[PDB]
Amino acid sequence: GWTDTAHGSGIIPMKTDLELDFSLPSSASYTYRRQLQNPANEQEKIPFHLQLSKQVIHAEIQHLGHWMDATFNLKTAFHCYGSCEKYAYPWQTAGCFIEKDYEYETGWGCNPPDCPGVGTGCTACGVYLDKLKSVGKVFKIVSLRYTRKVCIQLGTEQTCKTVDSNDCLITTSVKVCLIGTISKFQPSDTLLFLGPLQQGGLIFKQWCTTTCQFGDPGDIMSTPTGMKCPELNGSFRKKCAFATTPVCQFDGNTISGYKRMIATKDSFQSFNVTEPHISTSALEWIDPDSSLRDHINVIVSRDLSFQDLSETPCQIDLATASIDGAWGSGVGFNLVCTVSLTECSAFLTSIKACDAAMCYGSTTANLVRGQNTIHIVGKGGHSGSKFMCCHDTKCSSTGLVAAAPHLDRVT
Amino acid sequence: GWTDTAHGSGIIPMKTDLELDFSLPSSASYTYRRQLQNPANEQEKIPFHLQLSKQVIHAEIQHLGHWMDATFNLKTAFHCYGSCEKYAYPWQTAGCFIEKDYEYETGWGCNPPDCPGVGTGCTACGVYLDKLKSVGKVFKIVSLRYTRKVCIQLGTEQTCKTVDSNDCLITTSVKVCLIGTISKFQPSDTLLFLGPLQQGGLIFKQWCTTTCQFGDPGDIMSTPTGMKCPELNGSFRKKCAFATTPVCQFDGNTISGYKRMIATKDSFQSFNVTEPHISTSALEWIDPDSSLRDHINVIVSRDLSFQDLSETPCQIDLATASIDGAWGSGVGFNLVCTVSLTECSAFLTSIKACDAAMCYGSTTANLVRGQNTIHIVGKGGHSGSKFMCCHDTKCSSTGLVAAAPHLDRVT
Amino acid sequence: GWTDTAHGSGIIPMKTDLELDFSLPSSASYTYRRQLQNPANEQEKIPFHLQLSKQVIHAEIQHLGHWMDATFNLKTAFHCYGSCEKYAYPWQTAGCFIEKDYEYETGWGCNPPDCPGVGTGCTACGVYLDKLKSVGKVFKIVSLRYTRKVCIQLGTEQTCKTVDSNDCLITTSVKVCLIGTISKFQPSDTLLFLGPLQQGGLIFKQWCTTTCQFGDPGDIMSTPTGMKCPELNGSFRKKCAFATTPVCQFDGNTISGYKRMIATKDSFQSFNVTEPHISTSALEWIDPDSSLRDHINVIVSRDLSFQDLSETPCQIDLATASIDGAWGSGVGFNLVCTVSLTECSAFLTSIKACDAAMCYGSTTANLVRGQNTIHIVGKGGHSGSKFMCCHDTKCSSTGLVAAAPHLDRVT
Ligand SMILES: *[C@@H]1O[C@H](CO)[C@@H](O[C@@H]2O[C@H](CO)[C@@H](O[C@@H]3O[C@H](CO)[C@@H](O)[C@H](O)[C@@H]3O)[C@H](O)[C@H]2NC(C)=O)[C@H](O)[C@H]1NC(C)=O
Ligand SMILES: *[C@@H]1O[C@H](CO)[C@@H](O[C@@H]2O[C@H](CO)[C@@H](O[C@@H]3O[C@H](CO)[C@@H](O)[C@H](O)[C@@H]3O)[C@H](O)[C@H]2NC(C)=O)[C@H](O)[C@H]1NC(C)=O
Ligand SMILES: *[C@@H]1O[C@H](CO)[C@@H](O[C@@H]2O[C@H](CO)[C@@H](O[C@@H]3O[C@H](CO)[C@@H](O)[C@H](O)[C@@H]3O)[C@H](O)[C@H]2NC(C)=O)[C@H](O)[C@H]1NC(C)=O
Incomplete structure (x- = not known):
């Protein structure tokens, strides 16, 4: 049955004025001009002008916020008597903190020498992150589109239209087809910009989403709504010794996700950007990588046999x-x-x-x-x-x- | 040397009757008819009919079973005397449970007031998952194929064949070539259907495989062979206090992988399906996403110079x-x-x-x-x-x- | 403005001698010969010869070393008196070890019967990996290139050039265009060869990079610089009982990443290689998978209207x-x-x-x-x-x- 989704042409190749067929980098523009034979006149010539813009990447994104570096800190606060809720603790002022309470656990093999309590008081253990510093801006790719502006002029009639990377533009006597290729980015990729957008960034395939622990890529994020703090990968311990104040220990990871990433920075993929444009839900740019090439085909046929295959009565x-x-x-x-x-x-x-x-x-x-x-x-x-x-x-x-x-x- | 793997044609463009060149969505079918000039007769016309089916995705899959939601539970069972193996525990009836035993560890700073045991008995700690409910069906992609049925009729001779997305069909006087494109799915992707197949699903890149911990995507799976239960991300502790029954503590994750996923559901990629067909090792469907487009080229040449490039004597x-x-x-x-x-x-x-x-x-x-x-x-x-x-x-x-x-x- | 990046031709299809258009597997070579009409002579014929090599994959790689299997071991070393640093421990000779010290913690509810120490000595807990065996060689993909050698001969003039998978070769009267396709491999993929390169390998998407714990893919790697040992996923415990030597416990994963992988080996993607060539920073091979197909188009036009679209004065x-x-x-x-x-x-x-x-x-x-x-x-x-x-x-x-x-x- 009928469809208008076939974007292209039917032609008799004998009746074709011109065919261009070439490979072009996604970040390259191209211009072509030619004087074509007027079949009715054969004295005055009919100008043909083709312009292809550079291909623009449009990524719908999620603004994940700023990835943060931080220093791990562990502190003990012991009280011989009193519930843990009775006291304030210095880590409660930090950007991120996690507290483990050993409540009503005093005993004469774990008490300081001034504490005769038995089943009393509180050893409060606090992990807190400080020296929080933004290391970059983070975007998650929701979807990707690759478009070129395509302008065709034949005689006095011009048509310009945005054309997607595997689509065709059809006018009265002209067809321009784009055949896409390699895609460097994928939906759900996470992009980290360590500086201005123009300096490019890093691609991460495994940015923490459903569980973020200190040490993960994306562990500490600062958003407009506030800090989003990670859980801990490791566990607390209350070290006991006679006539000694309990000592909090933590056996897990104490190095931030940023420092772990930087230590092996060259394991990850960089990308570069030109002419970046930031909008409410999207990032647009041109990738200066010229190894990414599209295939282009152009047909000109000023003959009655040229068919627009998208035409239907519907x-x-x-x-x-x-x-x-x-x-x-x-x-x-x-x-x-x-x-x-x-x-x-x-x-x-x-x-x-x-x-x-x-x-x-x-x-x-x-x-x-x-x-x-x-x-x-x-x-x-x-x-x-x-x-x-x-x-x-x-x-x-x-x-x-x-x-x-x-x-x-x-x- | 000889090869039959070149699927296409050599032609003299001057001797070509017709060329179609167009972009078509993978989920679109297309029909084209034309009366071509009979060179020998030039009175009666030779019909040409082209039919392209919608592109069908065939994914070889692994039936991973049903992903399960559940509630985390922790219980203590203390006995002053007796080995841990001596007693039954209520969590041993659960769909999933993990037990940590503190055996022969009684002492007068950790015993209930009726227990004078020293180095005796058992504090048994049980984590168990209950309220197990299937949340969806899960398939892992083994491989992907993209095919269209292509039918060509020229005069009274018809040829229909299944053609892969980057292959060509060649008949006596006709060549149809498909040039594939974007692939939304990748081998090893995991697909989760939260409902009937027709309602589509979610793509997961990091479904747990070699280590599944409670909280991971895929942590709890129900298969025909039985439950496949996750390990725990976190660790037990036996909290001690004088004249008090030991209390089991667990410091790790207590939220199911399903609930963690749902909380950030919009971090993941959806896909939609039409006409799904389920088989023993495979899932087939048509993706209604019309942004995925193939390039199609059709040549008709009823001239002796038309060559089938796949022809060899071998x-x-x-x-x-x-x-x-x-x-x-x-x-x-x-x-x-x-x-x-x-x-x-x-x-x-x-x-x-x-x-x-x-x-x-x-x-x-x-x-x-x-x-x-x-x-x-x-x-x-x-x-x-x-x-x-x-x-x-x-x-x-x-x-x-x-x-x-x-x-x-x-x- | 001017660009030389458009690799292709402008032609008048009426003036075209020959067009080849076909699909070809990446691992297939192809040869084509034809005697073309001499327009000036029309007695002696002009030979045309086309040769396309098989497509060669060139992966820039990081030599990650050898992935190792190992057995998990846990040992306790107790001393009633003396700092932990005072003593040598048998695990300190192992390829990989992690030690947790419980120092100055003796007490009369956790001591052997010959130890009256209080707040003294050391329970030293050692995890060590032994029976270390290389299971394969590991490479991380830095970048990918896909090339064919393309040779064109028309008359007595031959041009051979390496052509990338989405590029074109243009001579005086000939254009050969390649349109790439499916890519099985991606940058940052990790390749594991369990044997000789010729036997192929496994693709891993989630090889441990920023945090490697025992049980992960890539947990234990042997490099020219030495062992790279994993951290532990789990935590230690000092089990106490009256009149008993402390016993070290470990609650985490005790199964190597290799054994966990092998147990579910068929969850992963294999790939096969022919004619592998290893260099300082790269691996080259031909993928014998014939389902990967490129599109090829060849035009011959010995007419003055054939334009090299890469020509500029610049x-x-x-x-x-x-x-x-x-x-x-x-x-x-x-x-x-x-x-x-x-x-x-x-x-x-x-x-x-x-x-x-x-x-x-x-x-x-x-x-x-x-x-x-x-x-x-x-x-x-x-x-x-x-x-x-x-x-x-x-x-x-x-x-x-x-x-x-x-x-x-x-x-
Ligand atoms: C292509 O993209 C990569 C990845 O973003 C670019 O590398 C980045 O380069 C910038 C600027 O050179 C680095 O910024 C920082 O600048 C301070 C000066 O304020 C400098 O002292 C620091 O040492 C730091 O390098 C940024 O760190 C770096 N990012 C990474 C991940 O290496 C690269 O320059 C781009 N190439 C282009 C645009 O040609
Ligand atoms: C394209 O695919 C997505 C992803 O599967 C579809 O979203 C899914 O839509 C179904 C039906 O609307 C949701 O099912 C559930 O239905 C119950 C009623 O029994 C409803 O009360 C629940 O709130 C629930 O939504 C399903 O949850 C939802 N899945 C996700 C991940 O959001 C979408 O509808 C599809 N679009 C189409 C087919 O046009
Ligand atoms: C395509 O690639 C796969 C993946 O590498 C190949 O499977 C691999 O096959 C080799 C040889 O058959 C296996 O090697 C080992 O050989 C010893 C004998 O020394 C044998 O006793 C062991 O049982 C073991 O299989 C290797 O394990 C295996 N790798 C995997 C991951 O299964 C496959 O053979 C290749 N197909 C070809 C080249 O046609």
Whole structure:
């Protein structure tokens, strides 16, 4: 049946004016001009001009905050009598602290010489992190898009459009196809910028998410809402000796995740960025790595036999019915779309979830004549995004905001 | 030397009837019809019909079972006298439990007031998981294949064949090439379905495999063979106080892997599925994500100059000699093939490992005239799979089953 | 503006002598011969010969050493009096050991019957690994390149060149384009060879790097500099009983990472290798997996309208100014290049970082007429590599060595 998702052309190669076929780095732009033969005139020439922008990476991201370095500290506070809750402890002022209480445990083989208590008091053990310093900014990739602006001019008619890395642009007599390739980044990668965005960063595959312990990548994060402190990898001990104050011991890791990373820094992957652009839910940049190459094919055919394979009689109207799920999420939001099809018995097409600035996901819709209900998934966006059901360049007149994502550590 | 692995055509573009070149979403089908000029007749027309199915993902998988939620529980059982083995404990009835025994350790600074024992008895500490509930079904990806059914009709001759995502189909006068792209899934990804397959799921990159501790993704799994219980991340302590029964303490993680995941659910990647088909060793589905696009090129040339580049004089016969390794495995099985070559001094070709329904791997064989011994690797399959050495559409007359895979946790 | 990075051709398809378009396995070579029509003579024919090598994988690697199996051992050494430093312990001779000291802690509820000490002596607890045996060799992937040697002969002129997997080769009348595909390996993957390189190996996504605990993949590594021993996942305990020598206990993992891996071996991905070649900073091989296919397109056009799209008037000279960063690193080294442009107002081109044998990275340089300062990133190489700024086939006359990478565990 009908579909408008085939983006390309049918041609008779005998009737083709020009074909360009080449490899181009993702971070390279390209310009091409040529005077083509006027078949009707054969005196005055028809200009052809092609412009391809550099490929721009658009990563929907989660702002994870600032990764922090810190120094590990362990302190003992002993009281012969009294519950642990009775006393204040110096570590309770720290950015991060964890306290283990040995309450009502005094005994004459573990007491200082001035303490005759038995089953009393408190040995309070405190681990606290201080000298907290931001070492960089951290982003988690929600999704990736790779686009070039493509401008075609043949005679006096120009068409410019943003084209994704494995898509084609088709005009009256011109087809430009991009064939993507290698992807350096993957969804759920974590990017760490140790300095300004322009200086590039490090890719981490195993940034701590469901359990963060001191020593992990991402163990200590500073966010606008506050510190997010790690758990401890190791365990406390109350060392006892006759006529001696108890001594807190900790047997686990005492070196921050940042210092452990730096010690073996060259185990990780760097990436570099040019022209970075930061937005509410996204980072855009051009990767100066010229080893990443796309394949480009351009056809010009001013002949009646040139076919736009996306052309169908089918027409659709869209309305955004409901939403659930979250913005800024790799799980995403689910948009419910009412899609009405005319002029065709059936129509396979692509329905997109877009806000006023950007699209966040597209679903193949198998439509039948009349009304259809289509669920589509979007990933990314922010709390102000009004998500709409869209097709080609047209969107529904109303949009819906999604809920806030769930990105909480349990402790 | 000769090879039949080049799937494509040589043509004179002047002698080409038609070329289609376009981008198509993996989840889109496409149909194209055209009446082509009869060069011998030029009155009656020759029909051309192209049909491309939607691309189907075939993932060989490991059925990891059901991921379970649970509640953490800690209990103390003290006996003044008697070995720990002498007594039964209530946690010994649980789906998962871990017990730490403090045996023959009684002393007058750690005993209840009715216990004068010294170096006797037992403080038994039990961690047990209860309220076990399945939260979803889990599959590990062994391998991935992406195929479309491609049908070509020119005049009265039709050819339909399954074509992989970076392969070509060649008939007498027609070539259809697919150029694959982005892959959302990777081998060793773990897929979690929280509900029916049709509702999609979550991708996990770090599902616990060699060490599973309570709190990890995949910590508690229910399989047909029984529960697979996690180890503990943390350590026990016997808290002592005069004239008091010992109290078991546990300092580690007490929150299940499921609850930790849900708390930060939007850190993970969702995927959606249509038309899912479950089999003994595999899951097949169509991904409704229309942002994944393949490149398609179609050539029609009813001219004598159209060359099938896969044509050679070389002929082979195959026999399956032996096997080792495992089914259902990302390491795979190794099939030993005796391949006999005639009509050519040398022949580079592809030898496949297939059962009666499916192929599981292909190896480039550098053959010389006469008999050859070729080792090929297959991944996936099940205990009933009779694996055969195959070439093109022909297989050896005998096959061999592989051994069961090793997928055991140590404790 | 001008760029030489577009590798391909502009043609009039009517003026094309021949087009080949086909899919080819990465591990397949291919040969094609044809006698083409001489347009000037039309009696004697012009030979065309195409040869494509098998695709070679070049992985820049880090030699991580040998992964070791071992047996866990725990021993107690008690002394009624004396500091722990006073005594030698048998575990101090082991390849790996970790010692926990309970110093000055004697008491009459934890002493052997011959020890009346109070707050004296030492219970020394030693974990040591013995029966250390190498189980395989380990390499971490720094970067990946996929190349074919491509030879073109038309008449008496031959051109052979190494072509990357998404690049094109252009001669006077011939264009050969490669379109890459699926990549089985990723940067930062860890490869384990349990035997000779020819027997293949296992891919690990989560080899321990910043924290290695006994039981992890990569926990125990033997390098030329010495053993790199893991930390412990678990904690010690001094078990006390009246009239009994203290007993050291360890509650954590006691099974090596190798044994845990082997127990669930079929959870991991195997890969196979042919014609492996080992060098100071790299491993090269051909993957016999024939399911990995590239797309190949060949155009021959002996017509004046055939355009080399890489041709520009722009000319550059290079000098290598300075370097920082490290060899053998996925973070890489940063080479500072002085690039001088003539014949053009502006020129977008690719500047490479190469030593005498190999290139390690390329950067898109946006040059303006006159002198430019360009920073480029290279990954890989070794301590003897003299890295140079290069363009096309030309390099600066001087090069600079980089510093040694930081690949240290903290303990
Ligand atoms: C490509 O990306 C890498 C990774 O980000 C870049 O390495 C980074 O380079 C910056 C600047 O050279 C380093 O910043 C710091 O600067 C202070 C001066 O304030 C300096 O004293 C410190 O020693 C420190 O190096 C940053 O640490 C470094 N990051 C890493 C992970 O090595 C690289 O420069 C980029 N290459 C380009 C843009 O050509
Ligand atoms: C695309 O895939 C995602 C991920 O699986 C889908 O999200 C999932 O949606 C289902 C159904 O809406 C959720 O199921 C559960 O249903 C009960 C009712 O019995 C409901 O009360 C619960 O609140 C729960 O949501 C499932 O939790 C959810 N999974 C995740 C990880 O969020 C999504 O709906 C799919 N989009 C489509 C098919 O358009
Ligand atoms: C493709 O690669 C896999 C993974 O390396 C290969 O499996 C490996 O096969 C070798 C040789 O068969 C195994 O070596 C060992 O040999 C001793 C004899 O000295 C044998 O007694 C042991 O049982 C052991 O198997 C190696 O263990 C095995 N590795 C794994 C991870 O299974 C496979 O053979 C390759 N297939 C080819 C080259 O066709």
